[PDB]
Design a protein around this ligand. Structure first.
Ligand SMILES: Nc1ncnc2c1ncn2[C@@H]1O[C@H](COP(=O)(O)OP(=O)(O)OP(=O)(O)O)[C@@H](O)[C@H]1O
Ligand SMILES: Nc1ncnc2c1ncn2[C@@H]1O[C@H](COP(=O)(O)OP(=O)(O)OP(=O)(O)O)[C@@H](O)[C@H]1O
Ligand SMILES: O=C(O)C[C@H](NC(=O)CP(=O)(O)O)C(=O)O
Ligand SMILES: O=C(O)C[C@H](NC(=O)CP(=O)(O)O)C(=O)O
Ligand SMILES: O=C(O)C[C@H](NC(=O)CP(=O)(O)O)C(=O)O
Ligand SMILES: [Zn+2]
Ligand SMILES: [Zn+2]
Lengths: 310, 145, 310, 145, 310
């Protein structure tokens, strides 16, 4: 079987560079030659316990493009966990008797990992667990960086905004750190800085990173400008001074951008990216979102189908 | 004083309309020299307003947007001190950007789009139909930004 | 391609008589000879931002009867628009990278039109936008009027109740006005009258219409009695005197009804149609609702499938 | 053309301020002849705006407000075609009604009283102290509300 | 008449040193020799639009001790301003036809000053207006300092806590600045610093003040340690990191205090003064509160009587 067959996909920290490249290679193949019946006779649970537009709808669309069926919920309020007091453990224990895989997003860190301890032989795919990990975001991000830059090595990557609570940047930094020669610029409010366990990991691998207080400092050298939303729903009340976006990218800020540079954003955006950016050649956040289909199809295929696709 | 070498002269503007034109179309947001005369004697009109804008030109569409406020105005295009073109505004098909839809439940108030209204003659008034909500209003009650 | 292939379906005001007849002709064909795989490999978004029973469930059932898959939501509360502050524009910008068409209902007038400005090559079908338009209601209504009356020309049509906020009657009046010799009776509270832009349109076409203060006035001549619900969720507080239905149709009111006459109602009804009407031969609101399947199948087929069905 | 016999010429207005004064003082709400120059050359200040109004003089309030909007402007009073009075507008001690206290928790926002600020000329900017909340602000913060 | 007869008492900025001394001398006399009939036949309004314990109760007790009657309200929810949309202006316009003076506290800065514009010949006494002024607190504070220190000049005074929103310290600093040779130590979070207009005032009068990051820094030299509560009901959400007391005085911190030093606090305290301070000889906040009686009686007597002989 392929190395990802029947594997839980919980944290980028658990995956290797080879695993990441495998997903991307599979994504390329399915995009060139769709296999609309590859997951025929699979039923997959889509269990979202906090809000989502892109992640849930792209995952379900991917399941349908591969011929699988979908059950689940987008709100926990009308599950028995919502109204009758059921634990998450018991919820997973029953759902795992029904379906071939479970895709879940949850407001508490660790929820996906917990699910694996109750799902038996059923794979859990983490669609986001509190401010911890977001591995399928990272897969589409890498696909998008590869598409636009031609490589995942030796890149200048700026990450901007709420790095403390951004599960997106925890996962993406851990992922890009598995490739060679990448350099990171972190542009965050002091209260929302990249967590030490990420920084320690970079130092371990001998990867260059530095803090900056403005986008303009780094604009001339970045290949990828990764903007993020302030995770207001994760903030402690003591952190409320940072609700508003501290860095706002506008079209005029892009004068000295490299021609190859792309502006990415896992979305949704509030005001951190002005709408005048949308029409510039550097804007790629919507193309990025569309790549979620190819990345999420690839992952489903690899986890649920024994043979490598070609 | 001091006639212009090139630009636009908007002549025969009705009284009380010159200022409205300046406000609405943001005509004074420029570094180009502007000359304005208000309540000037006309004879043809008795009283008129007059706007002169240097090194600045109006397309036919831009000229037409004036039709709502000064349908009888003359727009003179000036080059090498001479009038090289005279045009009168004709009622446009649409009015975009400058107006605000009076419907409080219209999507245009909440979202990053520009306002837009189809223009038509109704009785002896002008009815504006919002591109988004499709409600229609007399131009009198459709306010500007 | 057929004239409706890949077209947005936003307002009846944008469609011609030929367009309407095309949908109806296609509805007849699919009803006689179902094509359960016509939209196989399509994935369609069903995005309802306000309440619905008939419109959403009939649309989704139609997608399934044609072999398409469905993703979406029936509530905006757990989308990223609901919880993270995302604009509708950005919501459409991402969903349009996933699906082959977007069906949407929204509480603000103009929402469907706005969506078309962000959906790229993806068709938007307006399932209702505030009190503005409801074009697929009109398609099933016309199918139902045609079925029961044998024509769409030279009919006597009464519309009763909340005409100001009824998106149903805005669309249906504009539609019937594209056929010849129809005559309208408007029975509404003064505060909830048919809007002037509808009346002007009728006057333009030289179509006879008149206001009446009772159903009984017109009962002897109407072929179609179209009853409506007071749109209480659209009312300004200053209009609250009209919350209760001003006209209540009961079985006894139908003594002098023409034999061919049908009572229609886009539903839901509150008290404007007493339950004793349900058993009379004039009641056709449930048959009407069932025709939503044929009209909505036809529209999906025409928009998403290049060739004319036969 | 047609120098005026009696009225007012406001000179040495900073660029992009002339149009603002026309609005704030509702100067175009008259039948009196008005001429306006915007972005006129100025040896004294590079570029300037200029407003001429026949048979009309600034009210006491308008003169007081002018000292805030355009300190270095020149107010010329004219009679029988001659400049009779000339001065930069006198800065007042108080200014009422027109300004808005930037303290959002000021009682002055919710209640039927006229705004009022103690005006004191300072070195670089000018200070406005609210009569009600007693807070003081730079006129840069009070203006452009 | 006496200098304060029929005067509004709105801001310490409108009072002279002589005014303050007059109130303190009068308070000393009333404390020594009560005048239970001084305000006989006076009816006074006590109008509190935000919460109070000390200020309202000591005010009303003071009125009763001088023989006056009291009417008013301790919250506005059942006034016509609270239920019928009435303005504060009109509220003052009618109450001032009833009573001989108005004591008012209000959550908006400037409310008391506004009241003077509608109260005609009826004196208004400011019991607190938003985060602006609190002149009667300052009167009792001065009285307490004078009692325990023997003087109001050449003092070393520390003010700790929320100095930005503390109407207590705005009034107190202004009053103490009218005396000679006082020295100020301001110990506050950067976000809640003593406002610049207070500092500028101190500068213009050539008064020495300095900032400090800890109490112990100045403990050995202070005659008065004035502690304050974080005014959480005034904070902007951006300032919520400051809700907890940054400086917590405990009994152990007093080891190097001057013997004569008093700990004052206008109250209520949350956690900024630990309860183990209460039993120490330096704790004087309850005695301070007790002195509200004599200061407020003094003020009422001077405002409502032409002269006093005692
Ligand atoms: N070089 C210039 N600089 C400034 N203003 C000019 C210049 N040339 C023409 N104008 C102005 O343009 C307007 C029209 O000029 P034109 O020579 O056509 O007069 P006209 O034929 O009387 O106009 P109309 O007949 O349309 O009333 C006049 O108001 C005139 O002041
Ligand atoms: N009769 C008039 N009609 C219209 N404008 C006039 C009249 N007399 C003077 N002005 C205008 O008033 C302004 C001041 O005129 P003045 O003769 O004082 O010029 P000045 O000596 O250069 O003044 P300053 O030294 O203030 O620049 C000038 O811009 C001038 O055009
Ligand atoms: O929410 C963000 O800002 C980033 C990120 N966003 C998404 O996954 C997109 P969505 O919430 O629409 O599925 C996330 O962590 O949920
Ligand atoms: O709601 C009405 O009364 C008429 C009309 N009704 C429907 O479309 C039926 P539903 O809301 O169940 O989809 C509408 O405009 O939504
Ligand atoms: O509330 C404070 O912390 C200080 C001060 N406290 C008081 O006046 C005491 P009270 O609110 O019990 O009348 C105030 O400004 O209201
Ligand atoms: Zn609109
Ligand atoms: Zn104020």
């Amino acid at each position: 079987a392929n190395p990802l067959y029947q594997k839980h996909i919980i944290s980028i920290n658990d995956l290797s560079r080879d695993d990441l490249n495998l997903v991307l290679a599979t994504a390329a193949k399915l995009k060139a030659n769709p296999q609309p019946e590859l997951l025929k006779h699979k039923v997959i649970a889509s269990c979202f316990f906090e809000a989502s537009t892109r992640t849930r709808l792209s995952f379900e669309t991917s399941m349908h493009r591969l011929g699988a069926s979908v059950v689940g919920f987008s709100d926990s309020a009308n599950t028995s966990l919502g109204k009758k007091g059921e634990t998450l453990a018991d919820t997973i224990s029953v759902i795992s008797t029904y379906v071939d895989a479970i895709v879940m997003r949850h407001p508490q860190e660790g929820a996906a990992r917990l699910a694996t301890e109750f799902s038996g032989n059923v794979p859990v795919l983490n669609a986001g667990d509190g401010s911890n990990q977001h591995p399928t975001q990272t897969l589409l991000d890498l696909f998008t960086i590869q598409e636009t830059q031609g490589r995942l090595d030796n890149l200048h990557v700026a990450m901007v905004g709420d790095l403390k609570y951004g599960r997106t940047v925890h996962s993406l930094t851990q992922a890009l750190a598995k490739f060679d020669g990448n350099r990171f610029y972190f542009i965050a409010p002091d209260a929302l800085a990249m967590p030490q366990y990420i920084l320690d990991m970079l130092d371990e691998k001998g990867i260059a990173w530095s803090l900056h207080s403005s986008i303009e400092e780094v604009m001339a050298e970045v290949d990828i400008l990764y903007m993020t939303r302030v995770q207001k729903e994760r903030l402690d009340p003591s952190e409320y001074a940072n609700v508003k976006a501290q860095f706002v990218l506008r079209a005029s800020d892009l004068h000295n951008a490299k021609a190859n540079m792309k502006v990415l954003h896992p979305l949704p955006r509030v005001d951190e990216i002005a709408t005048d950016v949308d029409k510039t050649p550097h804007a790629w956040y919507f193309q990025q979102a569309g790549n979620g289909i190819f990345a999420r199809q690839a992952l489903l295929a690899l986890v649920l189908n024994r043979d490598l696709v070609l | 004083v001091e006639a212009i070498k090139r630009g636009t002269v908007i002549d025969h503007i009705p009284a009380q309309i010159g200022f409205k034109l300046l406000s609405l179309f943001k005509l004074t947001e420029t570094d180009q020299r502007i000359t304005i005369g208000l309540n000037l004697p006309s004879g043809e009109m008795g009283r008129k307003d007059l706007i002169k804008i240097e090194n600045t030109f109006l397309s036919e569409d831009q000229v037409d947007q004036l039709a709502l406020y000064a349908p009888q105005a003359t727009v003179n295009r000036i080059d090498n001190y001479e009038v090289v073109g005279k045009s009168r505004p004709s009622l446009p098909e649409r009015i975009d950007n400058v107006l605000v839809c009076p419907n409080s439940n219209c999507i245009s108030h909440a979202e990053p789009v520009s306002s837009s209204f189809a223009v038509r003659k109704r009785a002896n008034d002008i009815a504006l139909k919002c591109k988004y909500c499709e409600k229609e209003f007399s131009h009198n009650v459709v306010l500007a930004n």
